[PDB]
Amino acid sequence: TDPIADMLTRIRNANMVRHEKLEVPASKIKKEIAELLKREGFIRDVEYIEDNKQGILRIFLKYGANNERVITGLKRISKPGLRVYAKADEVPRVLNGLGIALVSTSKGVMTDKDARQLQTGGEVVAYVW
RNA sequence: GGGAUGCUCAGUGAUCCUUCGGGAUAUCAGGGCAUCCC
């Protein structure tokens, strides 16, 4: 069972059917992931919806001029039962820089460019392009 | 009993950095407390 993979799937599906928005149970790691996508321009918005359970992340997807989808793909990389780890010179490049690798470092979850910047490795959580 | 979360502790077990002395703590795995679900 893999909540992060679930989120990427719900986003992939919504994006196919070109939905405006979607929702996932909130967790801190998924919060961070959604925030990165916003800050990298892959989604239009994310917000936290209160529910006295564990919260909801409502994500607003992004489509371009003539309904061009801004997101092309999402890949779960690291997994429960097979974690994926990069040293700071081995942090993957997604589509020669046109995509992003989401990396969990001891200084938070950031892009692959941020990782190489800070000179750090970590868990390679996912790919978006 | 099993899941899913949050606050917190520690840190080498995993992982990362290192001038090899040490250092980081997001995630994984530990400790404590707490909420929600079957």
Residue numbers in the entry: 27 to 155
From the manuscript:
Ribosomal protein S8 is highly conserved among bacteria and archaea and serves as a translational repressor of ribosomal protein genes in the bacterial spc operon. The complex formed between bacterial ribosomal protein S8 (r-protein S8) and 16S rRNA is a well-studied interaction that is specified by an internal loop. The S8 protein has two domains, N- and C-terminal, and the arrangement of α-helices and β-sheet strands that make up the domains is maintained when S8 binds to RNA.
The structure of the aptamer-bound protein is very similar to the free protein (0.65 Å rmsd of the back bone atoms). A10 and A29 at one end of the loop adopt a cis Watson–Crick/Watson–Crick base pair via an A10 N1-A29 NH2 hydrogen bond and weak A10 H2-A29 N1 hydrogen bond (similar to that between A1912-A1927 in Haloarcula marismortui 23S rRNA). Stacked against the A10-A29 pair is a G11-(G13-C28) base triple. The G11 base is further locked into position by a hydrogen bond between G11 O6 and U25 2′-OH. Also, the peptide bond between the highly conserved residues S107-T108-S109 stacks against the purine ring of A26. A26 functionally replaces A642 in the S8-aptamer complex.
